[PDB]
Amino acid sequence: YEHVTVIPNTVGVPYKTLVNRPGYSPMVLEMELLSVTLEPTLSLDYITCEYKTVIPSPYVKCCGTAECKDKNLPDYSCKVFTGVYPFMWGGAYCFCDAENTQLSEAHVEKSESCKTEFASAYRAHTASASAKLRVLYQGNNITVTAYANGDHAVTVKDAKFIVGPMSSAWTPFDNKIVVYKGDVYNMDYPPFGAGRPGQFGDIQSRTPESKDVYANTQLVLQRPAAGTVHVPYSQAPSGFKYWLKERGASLQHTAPFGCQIATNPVRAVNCAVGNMPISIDIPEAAFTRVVDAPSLTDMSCEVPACTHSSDFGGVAIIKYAASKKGKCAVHSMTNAVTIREAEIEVEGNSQLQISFSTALASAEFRVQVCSTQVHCAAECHPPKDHIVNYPAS
Amino acid sequence: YEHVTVIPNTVGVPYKTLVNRPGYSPMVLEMELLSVTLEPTLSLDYITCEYKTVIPSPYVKCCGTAECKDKNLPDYSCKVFTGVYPFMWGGAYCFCDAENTQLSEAHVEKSESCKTEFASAYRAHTASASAKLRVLYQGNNITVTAYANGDHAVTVKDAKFIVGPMSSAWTPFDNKIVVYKGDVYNMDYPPFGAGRPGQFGDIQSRTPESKDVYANTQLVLQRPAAGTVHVPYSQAPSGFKYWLKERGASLQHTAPFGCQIATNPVRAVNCAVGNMPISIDIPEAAFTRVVDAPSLTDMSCEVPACTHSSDFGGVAIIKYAASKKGKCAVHSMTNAVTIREAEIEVEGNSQLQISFSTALASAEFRVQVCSTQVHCAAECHPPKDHIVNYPAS
Amino acid sequence: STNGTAHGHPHEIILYYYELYPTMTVVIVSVASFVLLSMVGTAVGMCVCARRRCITPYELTPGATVPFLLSLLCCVRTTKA
Amino acid sequence: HTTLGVQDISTTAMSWVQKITGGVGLIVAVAALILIVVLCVSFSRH
Amino acid sequence: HTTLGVQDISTTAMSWVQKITGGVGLIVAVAALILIVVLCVSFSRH
Amino acid sequence: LSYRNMGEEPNYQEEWVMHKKEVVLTVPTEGLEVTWGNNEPYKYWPQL
């Protein structure tokens, strides 16, 4: 027997459903969402890391002129300085006084760390559903973990479970995201080949192992000091190193609805929003004909104690007259009151104690025991605490 | 100097643009699209193949009863047949006449072929476009391959090229696709754990090397023949084998806009539709001041031959009077006529022959040679062919 | 938290505001205003109807006074001088 | 759970207040009709 | 490149036909005005 | 010291505590999550 039900996308709240197969005794199932996964479809634009300013030994031409060769390298910079007289350990390196030159060449490359220390620039398109949920089937708690697409079926205790498809459609991620180790940031990063010096994206590469790189660092060579062999330069500091200090809190801490952000793959776990359908194909092996059950007559409902709260703060005693010994289902016919007991045992002229939860001060509710209904009168009182540590219906 | 231009998304048609930097002599660039692939992500749902009905030796219990054991196997079927009297080579296998039983057990597994012969069920999300543009820069054809997002910059001959972003987003693939070897089908396949017998998805597995499998084949054991040892059964034939015969033509043959479908990884190649922008940052080293050019005067235009077609079916001779020897740009000031020549050489009292393409029968067009304009009168005739094998403006 | 006593009377009624709220009370107040308007409209209609009754006998000549008391407060005071 | 749009209890008390409103509306409606009736009587009298 | 919306040629001939239409419209417009003028003359005469 | 609401509007706030400090934080119906250094986040929920 296929049972279709819709529950809100709220983790930690137990929801009860009445399964009524015609000709068979009613069944009550308790369902609770333990966690809800939203995985977005990603497309890597580029990756950013620390840059390496590769500077070789300067070509000091004694008694002559050196010439710059235009090289096809990222951020390639070249300059020749006239009238240089450099000094070494044992004296002057050159013979001439003013007829010497120094060729200072430089270029920007990806640092050795880029394979380990890097930030990935992703473009989030669409996302999917998928999460797990528990359910008390036949007086035992069972764990069900499946994709919330409404296609992925999972069989637990000979019962087929179909979760989803998700009602919404909200995600904490934007159309452009940035991922560093275990932190995800909603960033409007610069496009590929449009990075600025000193900012996030000053060095852009396709993958941490990629060959060709983009570099905009504003590298300019300076004239060396008097009698000194060195390559002085003016360059904007690493944009990635600066961002790692001035990025702030990630989505894990800033996202609404209490979203938990996980990595590898990047997805949002536990997120309250919208509803979710759940189909349960209960086997006929767990059903019992009505005839095989008992009836009930003259019923009276007395409420000796009631406190309107999030938990079952109400106690109710129901008197009855049963035809025979058997199991009867207990369910509240009022949407404001919820019963803790799913099924109880009856015999003849006896009584039953049930725990109930309600929000109303004056509660007039109908309780369906087996196939017969009884009216309950209750005057519930306010609780001592205004704020509670657990969610309710 | 940054030059922004918009060309239609049409492969095989050359487009000419006039680059006019104030104070510098005009420049003509001929661009032509080469290709425009399209790759879209895809999350493998499952894989389907031929199934294997694993049937062991039947347990024939002579003078006794055999009992079925409930096994956790895909499509596990068990049955015990009473009053069996089987025969072998040397006579009867059992002593008793009617007190014998036969246990017939069966289950469905993935065939050995599943590693080789299989169809993959993918879920297509978003697509990433990648191409190829030919540019006649400084009398030489250059190849530019970049992402059409309007961010990925490529430098060829010291000129920065920015392609895109795309005007439009159409793909021949739907949200659900099926891939078999080199053929892609737009199929609305059944979800994981919801396959029907005899249909595509009767056997569902995560990967061709996966351990656990889903099976719905409608397998029922039958009673064996009189004095015969065999396991007769009724089962719906392989859904994958049936689909391989009744699938029809793939996307490669049915897709619009003349799409070519490639595999490993799947993606659409060659597709027209919409326009595309192109930004070219031409270096200042490829520009020449105007003061370093010449002029012209008195110019008559004679058209000895014209045939209105997709190609340059028109010939035009322009007479002139030049001040000095230099290069002058040739461009049609009429949007209906296109000139093959971008630049020519002038001297003094001479002439020039140019090739032109037009659609109109009566063509009155202005040709701008250097900085002076000339009126051309042409009476073009129809071509021999009604259908051509190359696109035009 | 915020206890929502029952009453009474009224009193507690306003206490509930804190419990489930922003709103609630304002809508009730609007309803009360509408009720007051209905009450006021009825009274205005009643006064016009009272005129409709005193009509005819609005010309002149003896004849109430008379039924002018018993007489819906005008009636009289009205008959007289 | 819980959380929802009323109205709800608390019965009795609730009825006490509700009963106070709308009665006067009925009164003025009846009075209006009665005034119309008398007006028609005058119209007939003329 | 052709593939555009007209109109275009063929001059002369084209003018021959065009000139035939609209002239009568001008005539009836002028006549209308003249009739109004005469009407005003009558109004003045009265 | 960092804190956020467990609802639609998280409103993340961060501060480096160095001296003796007393902090008063409002707890909404959805809940308030407070992280104090390297300790596991403390969850709080107001009672009716």
Residue numbers in the entry:
A (entry chain A): 1 to 393
B (entry chain B): 1001 to 1393
C (entry chain Q): 843 to 923
D (entry chain E): 394 to 439
E (entry chain F): 1394 to 1439
F (entry chain M): 795 to 842
From the paper:
Here, we report a 5.3 Å three-dimensional high-resolution reconstruction of the CHIK VLP. The trimeric appearance of individual spikes was recognizable immediately, along with the inclined positions of the three E1 molecules surrounding each spike. The E3 glycoprotein, which is observed in some alphavirus structures, was not apparent in the CHIK VLP cryoEM density map. The crystal structure of CHIKV E1-E2 was fitted into the 5.3 Å cryoEM map using the program EMfit to maximize the average value of the density (sumf) at all atomic positions, to minimize the steric clash between symmetry related structures, and to minimize the percentage of atoms in low density. Within the CHIK VLP structure, the four quasi-equivalent chymotrypsin-like nucleocapsid proteins were organized as pentamers around the 5-fold vertices and hexamers around the 2-fold icosahedral symmetry axes. The glycoproteins and the nuclear capsid were separated by a ∼45 Å-wide lipid membrane. Thus, the i3 trimers in the VLPs were more compact with a greater number of interactions between its component molecules than the q3 trimer.
Chikungunya virus (CHIKV) is a mosquito-transmitted viral pathogen that causes fever, myalgia, rash, and severe arthritis in humans. Most neutralizing antibodies bind to E2, as this glycoprotein is more exposed on the viral surface than E1.
